[PDB]
Amino acid sequence: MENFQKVEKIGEGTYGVVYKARNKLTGEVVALKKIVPSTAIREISLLKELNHPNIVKLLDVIHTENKLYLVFEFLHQDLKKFMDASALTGIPLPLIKSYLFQLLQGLAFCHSHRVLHRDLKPQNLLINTEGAIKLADFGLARAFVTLWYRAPEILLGCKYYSTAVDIWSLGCIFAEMVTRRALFPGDSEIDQLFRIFRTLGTPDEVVWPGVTSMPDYKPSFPKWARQDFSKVVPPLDEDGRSLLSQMLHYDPNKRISAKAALAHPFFQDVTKPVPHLRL
Numbered sequence: 001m002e003n004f005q006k007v008e009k010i011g012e013g014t015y016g017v018v019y020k021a022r023n024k025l026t027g028e029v030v031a032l033k034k035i036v037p038s039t040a041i042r043e044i045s046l047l048k049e050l051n052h053p054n055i056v057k058l059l060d061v062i063h064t065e066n067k068l069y070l071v072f073e074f075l076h077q078d079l080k081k082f083m084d085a086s087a088l089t090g091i092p093l094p095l096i097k098s099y100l101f102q103l104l105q106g107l108a109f110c111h112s113h114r115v116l117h118r119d120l121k122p123q124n125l126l127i128n129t130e131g132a133i134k135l136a137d138f139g140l141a142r143a144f145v146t147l148w149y150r151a152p153e154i155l156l157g158c159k160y161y162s163t164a165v166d167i168w169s170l171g172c173i174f175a176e177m178v179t180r181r182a183l184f185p186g187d188s189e190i191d192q193l194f195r196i197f198r199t200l201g202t203p204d205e206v207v208w209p210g211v212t213s214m215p216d217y218k219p220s221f222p223k224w225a226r227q228d229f230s231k232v233v234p235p236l237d238e239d240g241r242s243l244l245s246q247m248l249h250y251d252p253n254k255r256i257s258a259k260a261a262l263a264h265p266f267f268q269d270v271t272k273p274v275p276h277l278r279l
């Protein structure tokens with residue numbers, strides 16, 4: 001640890017405080033993460049091999065007296081700040097398409113390695129000036145406040161959810177980049193659920209087999225009618241609405257996978273434009 005010097009507080013975290021720091025020896029700039037069980041130790045220790053260009057690289061792990069530290073590669077900005085910095089004009093679709101494309105590449109990689117992020121949000125999606133976007137905090141959930149990106153199966157008490165939960169979160173985020181407003185802004189677990197129901201229609205056995213046998217499912221749930229999808233993410237084109245719709249399928253097994261998503265017609269004319277940041 002005494003191989004670092006804190007440049008400045010960058011942001012609080014789910015499990016700890018995050019710091020920008022310079023490796024007193026290599027002078028390199030890194031993102032320090034201050035977080036114990038050996039399982040967690042092994043668990044996060046495995047992540048180090050989980051390398052991909054769209055996954056924020058985990059440089060090292062430093063466990064000292066209960067004090068666990070995670071060294072990560074540093075990027076200058078998250079997607080929440082980027083979205084706010086552009087709220088008035090909104091992100092140019094080409095960039096939205098490229099970002100969603102790269103994120104699907106990163107999810108495809110983790111998922112194949114039987115890994116899930118479990119908690120995707122604008123805050124754990126970092127960007128650089130080059131036009132690339134990466135996934136941060138992958139694998140941390142299994143090792144150990146917003147519900148806006150939480151998949152419905154999770155909210156329904158299912159304790160054995162699949163990689164599909166990440167896809168749902170990404171779909172939610174995709175909608176958010178297009179509308180400049182969060183798709184399902186819940187302020188409680190049930191409120192989160194009712195907002196999903198209000199937009200996608202209260203699920204039943206027809207669109208989601210086994211849905212009613214689920215843990216927190218209640219027959220007393222109000223019955224909201226599904227809303228024509230074109231009122232949800234306008235003016236996203238039909239290819240986009242098509243892809244988004246499959247990412248938001250109720251039935252986790254039906255919900256489109258990252259790999260399949262990477263071949264949707266929506267990405268046919270995808271590119272890699274550079275955004276404009278002000279560091």
Ligand SMILES: CC(C)c1cc(-c2cc(N3C[C@H](O)[C@@H](O)C3)ccc2O)nc(N)n1
Nearest residue numbers: 013031074075076077078081123124136137
């Ligand atoms: C826009 C602002 C939020 C930000 C975040 C980061 C930044 C953020 C993270 N995090 C910490 C969380 O656990 C994970 O969800 C993302 C990691 C490295 C960073 O450089 N770097 C810069 N320059 N600016």
